[PDB]
Amino acid sequence: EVAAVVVVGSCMTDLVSLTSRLPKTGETIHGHKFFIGFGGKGANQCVQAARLGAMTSMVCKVGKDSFGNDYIENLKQNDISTEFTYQTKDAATGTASIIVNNEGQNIIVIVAGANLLLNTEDLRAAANVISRAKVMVCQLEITPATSLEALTMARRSGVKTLFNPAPAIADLDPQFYTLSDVFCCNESEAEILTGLTVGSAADAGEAALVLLKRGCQVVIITLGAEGCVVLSQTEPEPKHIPTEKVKAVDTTGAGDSFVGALAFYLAYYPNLSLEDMLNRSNFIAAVSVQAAGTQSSYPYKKDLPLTLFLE
Amino acid sequence: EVAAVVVVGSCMTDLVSLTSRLPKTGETIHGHKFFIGFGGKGANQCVQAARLGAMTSMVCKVGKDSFGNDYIENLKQNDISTEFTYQTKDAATGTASIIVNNEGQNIIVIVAGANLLLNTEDLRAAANVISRAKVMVCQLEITPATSLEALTMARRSGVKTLFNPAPAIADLDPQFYTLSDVFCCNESEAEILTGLTVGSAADAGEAALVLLKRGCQVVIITLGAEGCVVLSQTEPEPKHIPTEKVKAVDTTGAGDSFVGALAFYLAYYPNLSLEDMLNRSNFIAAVSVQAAGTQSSYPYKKDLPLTLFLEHHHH
Ligand SMILES: Nc1ncnc2c1ncn2[C@@H]1O[C@H](COP(=O)(O)OP(=O)(O)NP(=O)(O)O)[C@@H](O)[C@H]1O
Ligand SMILES: Nc1ncnc2c1ncn2[C@@H]1O[C@H](COP(=O)(O)OP(=O)(O)NP(=O)(O)O)[C@@H](O)[C@H]1O
Numbered sequence: 109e110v111a112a113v114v115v116v117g118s119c120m121t122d123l124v125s126l127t128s129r130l131p132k133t134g135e136t137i138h139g140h141k142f143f144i145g146f147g148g149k150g151a152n153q154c155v156q157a158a159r160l161g162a163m164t165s166m167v168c169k170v171g172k173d174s175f176g177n178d179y180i181e182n183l184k185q186n187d188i189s190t191e192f193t194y195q196t197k198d199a200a201t202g203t204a205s206i207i208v209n210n211e212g213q214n215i216i217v218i219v220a221g222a223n224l225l226l227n228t229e230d231l232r233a234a235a236n237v238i239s240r241a242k243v244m245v246c247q248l249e250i251t252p253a254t255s256l257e258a259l260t261m262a263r264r265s266g267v268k269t270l271f272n273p274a275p276a277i278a279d280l281d282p283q284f285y286t287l288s289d290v291f292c293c294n295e296s297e298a299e300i301l302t303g304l305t306v307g308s309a310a311d312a313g314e315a316a317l318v319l320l321k322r323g324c325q326v327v328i329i330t331l332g333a334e335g336c337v338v339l340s341q342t343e344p345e346p347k348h349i350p351t352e353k354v355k356a357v358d359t360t361g362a363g364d365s366f367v368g369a370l371a372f373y374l375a376y377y378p379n380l381s382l383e384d385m386l387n388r389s390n391f392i393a394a395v396s397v398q399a400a401g402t403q404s405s406y407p408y409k410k411d412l413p414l415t416l417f418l419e
Numbered sequence: 420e421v422a423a424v425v426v427v428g429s430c431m432t433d434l435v436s437l438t439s440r441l442p443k444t445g446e447t448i449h450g451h452k453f454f455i456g457f458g459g460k461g462a463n464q465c466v467q468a469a470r471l472g473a474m475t476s477m478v479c480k481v482g483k484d485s486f487g488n489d490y491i492e493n494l495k496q497n498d499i500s501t502e503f504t505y506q507t508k509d510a511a512t513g514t515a516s517i518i519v520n521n522e523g524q525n526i527i528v529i530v531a532g533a534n535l536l537l538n539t540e541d542l543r544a545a546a547n548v549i550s551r552a553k554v555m556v557c558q559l560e561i562t563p564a565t566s567l568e569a570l571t572m573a574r575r576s577g578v579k580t581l582f583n584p585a586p587a588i589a590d591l592d593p594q595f596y597t598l599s600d601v602f603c604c605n606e607s608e609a610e611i612l613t614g615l616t617v618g619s620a621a622d623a624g625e626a627a628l629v630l631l632k633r634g635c636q637v638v639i640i641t642l643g644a645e646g647c648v649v650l651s652q653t654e655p656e657p658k659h660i661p662t663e664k665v666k667a668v669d670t671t672g673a674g675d676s677f678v679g680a681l682a683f684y685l686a687y688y689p690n691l692s693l694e695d696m697l698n699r700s701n702f703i704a705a706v707s708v709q710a711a712g713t714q715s716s717y718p719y720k721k722d723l724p725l726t727l728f729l730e731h732h733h734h
């Protein structure tokens with residue numbers, strides 16, 4: 109089973125406390141529910157792609173701890189290759205500690221942990237799998253040198269690079285743009301990266317063009333309920349792809365659903381137009397918002413309309 | 420091997436993130452370290468008593484989950500009986516999500532979880548062990564009704580009750596006071612319970628008298644570095660028991676150290692005066708503040724002065 113989608117990126121344990129009020133400095137507050145979830149942008153993306161039918165491989169590092177062992181089982185239960193899922197005793201599995209009130213306001217503390225210890229030696233071991241893939245997906249949740257090396261390796265073998273600059277930082281290494289065949293981010297990330305205000309699809313088109321001029325081949329900005337905007341070196345005029353209105357239950361994880369869907373279409377449906385791929389990816393992400401949670405909300409092929417898988 | 424000290428109360432997994440600044444509403448920040456620890460007032464108290472040499476048993480409920488299985492191992496490693504450590508599939512193990520900055524300031528979110536599912540049926544199964552104890556310790560980190568049930572059972576069997584109303588509730592059922600042989604709380608809890616300011620020993624004396632009149636046999640209010648204040652039905656005049664000054668490294672868990680030490684003394688040295696017990700308990704809690712962490716800071720008998728273990732009054 110040759111993997112067509114390789115994700116080099118993060119696995120994180122989500123530790124979620126639900127409360128009626130958020131704490132201030134020095135305060136202890138009592139909440140009403142705690143749960144553990146599997147997260148991390150890399151793993152989220154990988155899971156969505158796998159559930160659509162992709163043969164995937166997750167290159168990542170977790171701890172030699174209960175959370176790490178559980179994450180490995182999570183990837184296996186989602187039919188993801190863990191050949192290059194490493195474990196280390198030198199850091200805990202990455203964690204996202206999330207406090208959420210009943211209005212959806214939150215405080216989040218991320219400790220990337222073992223994710224940061226995925227190094228270039230670890231990557232090099234995956235060279236053969238990377239070279240045989242169709243798509244390589246990376247984000248900004250591991251150590252930058254490792255993600256840059258992954259993108260470089262993909263480019264050397266002609267593998268399509270899908271980069272999600274999330275979470276965004278203002279002064280991103282220029283190579284992230286120049287190594288990206290497809291660069292996909294949300295409005296708030298676009299603002300951080302470009303310094304422009306993005307309040308509309310037109311505004312997103314202006315931000316996208318800055319990103320394009322930094323060296324990306326294709327730029328997509330997701331707009332939540334307003335769909336997405338795309339432009340490319342060959343077609344630099346922005347195109348707004350809207351999505352039909354749905355009643356959202358929980359929008360958490362929608363961006364990773366979108367990126368994982370796009371990876372699937374890039375790998376398995378390469379002759380579809382970009383606009384068609386984005387229409388389908390918008391639809392799948394909009395399914396995800398109609399269920400609670402992150403990975404638990406990501407739809408399987410069997411539960412989706414047949415027309416999403418016709419060519 | 421009869422358990423002399425039975426703690427009916429909470430176990431909580433501490434989920435700790437270390438950061439350079441504490442976040443406010445709406446913020447996402449990155450920290451530099453995450454680790455898991457063991458907490459919960461009931462388990463903390465039980466651990467300190469066990470380390471002093473008590474035969475203890477923890478009546479508690481955790482989840483049928485990794486955190487719960489780990490907690491059971493923690494109690495076993497501290498030589499605590501786990502015969503009444505229940506598990507449930509109906510809720511996660513209780514959690515304390517803790518964010519700490521480089522100066523040691525924190526924000527905490529507690530989700531009681533499986534602790535709230537410790538129920539009447541569980542207490543009935545524990546009834547024989549409760550009834551045969553010397554001291555039954557409880558707090559307010561389980562369902563209040565379950566703590567009240569445990570106090571009731573202990574009282575009916577003539578077992579000494581040590582009640583720590585923590586965290587405090589302003590409209591606590593009157594029976595909590597009348598079922599409490601020893602009622603022990605800190606300044607902030609005393610303020611909630613009495614509606615007085617409690618900052619000083621004098622303040623604590625005034626608050627303690629309000630509590631005593633509600634039906635407690637003995638009231639103790641702890642004062643951090645200033646020791647504690649005690650009064651009783653037999654001796655209603657407040658006595659301030661000071662503690663010798665130490666260099667505090669980390670005061671987390673000191674209150675639970677104090678209560679676990681007091682439970683040990685009530686069970687194994689019942690002949691001693693309150694003042695004697697409290698001097699010793701103050702000293703043990705002050706040892707705990709000289710080391711990092713919560714349970715890991717609690718001293719063992721073998722590492723403490725011999726004078727703490729004499730059967731008779733000491734100067
Ligand atoms: N309320 C919504 N209704 C319909 N589709 C939605 C809604 N919110 C999000 N989506 C879809 O999900 C995609 C991604 O949402 P968006 O909020 O831009 O992602 P994000 O902020 O990157 N989230 P994430 O990366 O998982 O943390 C959008 O382009 C839509 O296709
Ligand atoms: N800085 C300190 N120096 C010396 N002894 C201390 C200090 N802080 C606390 N103690 C001892 O610890 C006891 C209890 O401390 P206190 O701060 O009153 O507990 P609490 O606030 O109920 N803590 P906890 O219940 O564990 O969260 C005091 O009576 C002292 O004996």
Ligand SMILES: [Cl-]
Pocket residue numbers: 219220221224450451452
């Ligand atoms: Cl880290």
Ligand SMILES: [K+]
Pocket residue numbers: 358359360361362396397398399400401402405
């Ligand atoms: K969702």
Ligand SMILES: [K+]
Pocket residue numbers: 669670671672673707708709710711712713716
């Ligand atoms: K300590």
Ligand SMILES: [Mg+2]
Pocket residue numbers: 274293294363364
């Ligand atoms: Mg996103």
Ligand SMILES: [Mg+2]
Pocket residue numbers: 585604605674675
């Ligand atoms: Mg206390």
